[PDB]
């Protein structure tokens, strides 16, 4: 819990909570050795999500001396794109004053070209396959990169994965994909690339921990708690996380307008503290059709993954607030 670090790669798609997840992982080097990040052109414009990833890496390196690591833009493309207005969030982040501290801009400008050479899917494969320790992959965007690696390399890749902790799906609760052509039963990360999700979630060669809407619905961050970051504004990570949650737009804001979803952050929190939730083994039948139920992750007839259940609000809160006083 403080004596040995897990080797971790973050496979993300650049929304505000992807970066909260990144900050939780990177701010806890006693627990997590972050050896790389992948960014997918899903809930962001990949150039923006890439730059924000880079600058956060640079800021942590400067402040707390966490190692620098390779970052790769995936070339995976969507089956179903995220709404364009949502994807702009990483551009907004890239313009934020806490992501434009002069040292971080200078270091990222220097490190950017070497990272631009990487292909994200290939980087994920290379980092896992060449690692001495088995690697924990945290997936907070769609499952396309994991799918590509499993398809290209099979057990040469999956044998080197410790576990895969994924944000996606909706098992016993409704989804969050509301479009003229959908029934509302699907979750967005799955919907973006349903065949990828089908390939990964039911891959018998990896241990998947799934943070579906079942778990994420129960742990919003209330406005009253987001305001708590103000007491820590002298810490860069509090300026970052407080702003990331305060910026919530569209369906990131719950019904009552006084709380926000924290989907990916809870997912990374599990890597820091596995007791934050109980796990249930579940067989899933991923809908890859073009019907209204496309992307649905219902229980199969007759396991694929271990679904997170009843996550601890207090543990989540305490972890996030401690992590964001790190620097």
Ligand X SMILES: OC[C@@H]1[C@@H](O)[C@@H](O)CN1Cc1csc2c(O)ncnc12
Is 18 annotated in the active site?
yes
Catalog residues that contact Ca ion under the rule CB under 5 A: 13, 15, 18, 140-141, 264
Q: Which member of 11, 104, 264, 287 is catalytic? A: 264
Alpha-carbon span 292 to 261, nearest angstrom: 25
Alpha-carbon span 170 to 297, nearest angstrom: 6
Name the residue whose CB lies closest to Ni ion.
3
Which residues lie below 8 Å from residue 184, measured CB to CB, with a gap of 6+?
174, 175, 176, 177, 178
Closest CA relative to residue 288, chosen from 200, 178, 164: 200
Which residues lie below 8 Å from residue 98, measured CB to CB, with a gap of 6+?
236, 239, 240, 243
Is 189 annotated in the active site?
yes
**Residue 84 contact partner, candidates Ni ion, ligand X, a second copy, none, CB within 5 to 8 A by sort of partner:** none
> Quick one: how many helices (H) and strands (E) in the chain?
15, 10
Number of neighbouring beta carbons within 10 Å of residue 53: 28
Judged by phi (left if over 0) then psi (alpha if -120 to 50, else beta), residue 250 lies in left
Q: Is residue 108 within 8 Å of residue 180, measured between CB atoms?
A: no
Is 17 annotated in a binding site? The answer is yes
Looking at residues 133 to 152 of the shown chain, list those that interact with Ni ion (rule: CB under 5 A).
144
Among positions 63, 64, 247, 288, the unique one binding a second copy when judged by CB under 8 A: 247
Residue 251 DSSP label: G
Looking at residues 84 to 103 of the shown chain, list those that interact with a second copy (rule: CB under 8 A).
85, 88, 91-102
Residues 186-225 vs a second copy: string with x where CB under 8 A? -------------------------------------x--
Is 126 annotated in a binding site? The answer is no
**Residue 7 contact partner, candidates Ni ion, ligand X, a second copy, none, CB within 5 to 8 A by sort of partner:** none
Is 264 annotated in the active site?
yes
Q: Which is nearer to ligand X, 20 or 60 (CB)?
A: 20
Residue 19: which H helix or E strand, with range?
A: helix 16-26
Q: Which member of 11, 13, 193, 287 is catalytic? A: 13
Q: Rule CB under 8 A: is residue 144 a binding residue for a second copy?
A: no
Q: Which member of 66, 80, 263, 287 is catalytic? A: 263
Report in angstroms how near the CB of residue 230 gets to ligand X at its nearest: 24
Catalog residues that contact Ni ion under the rule CB under 5 A: 1-3, 70, 85, 144, 193, 196
């Amino acid at each position: 819990g403080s004596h040995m670090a897990k080797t971790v790669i973050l496979d993300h798609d650049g929304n505000k909570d992807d970066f909260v997840a990144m900050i939780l992982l990177l701010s806890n080097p006693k627990k997590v050795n972050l050896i790389g990040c992948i960014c997918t052109d899903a809930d962001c414009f990949v150039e923006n999500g890439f730059d924000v990833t880079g600058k956060i890496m640079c800021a942590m390196h400067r402040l707390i001396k966490t190692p620098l690591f390779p970052i790769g833009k995936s070339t995976a493309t969507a089956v179903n794109a995220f709404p364009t207005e949502w994807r702009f969030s990483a551009k907004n982040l890239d313009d934020m004053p806490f992501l434009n501290i002069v040292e971080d801009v200078a270091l990222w400008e220097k490190l950017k070209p070497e990272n631009e050479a990487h292909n994200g899917q290939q980087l994920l494969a290379d980092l896992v396959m060449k690692s001495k320790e088995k690697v924990t992959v945290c997936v907070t965007g769609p499952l396309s990169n994991m799918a590509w690696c499993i398809e290209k390399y099979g057990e040469a890749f999956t044998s080197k994965v410790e576990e895969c902790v994924i944000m996606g799906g909706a098992v016993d609760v409704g989804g969050n994909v509301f479009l003229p052509t959908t029934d509302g039963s699907a979750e967005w990360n799955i919907y973006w690339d349903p065949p990828a999700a089908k390939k990964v979630l039911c891959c018998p060669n990896i241990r998947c921990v799934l943070f579906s809407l079942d778990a994420t619905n129960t742990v919003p961050v209330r406005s009253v708690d987001v305001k708590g970051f103000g007491a820590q504004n002298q810490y860069l990570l509090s300026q970052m996380v407080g702003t990331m949650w305060a910026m919530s737009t569209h369906e990131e804001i719950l019904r009552d307008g006084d709380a926000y979803y924290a989907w990916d952050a809870l997912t990374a929190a599990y890597i820091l503290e596995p007791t934050i939730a109980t796990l249930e083994p579940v067989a899933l039948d991923v809908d890859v059709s073009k019907g209204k139920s496309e992307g649905r992750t219902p229980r199969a007839s007759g396991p694929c993954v271990h679904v997170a259940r009843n996550p601890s609000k207090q543990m989540f809160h305490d972890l996030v607030f401690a992590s964001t006083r790190v620097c």
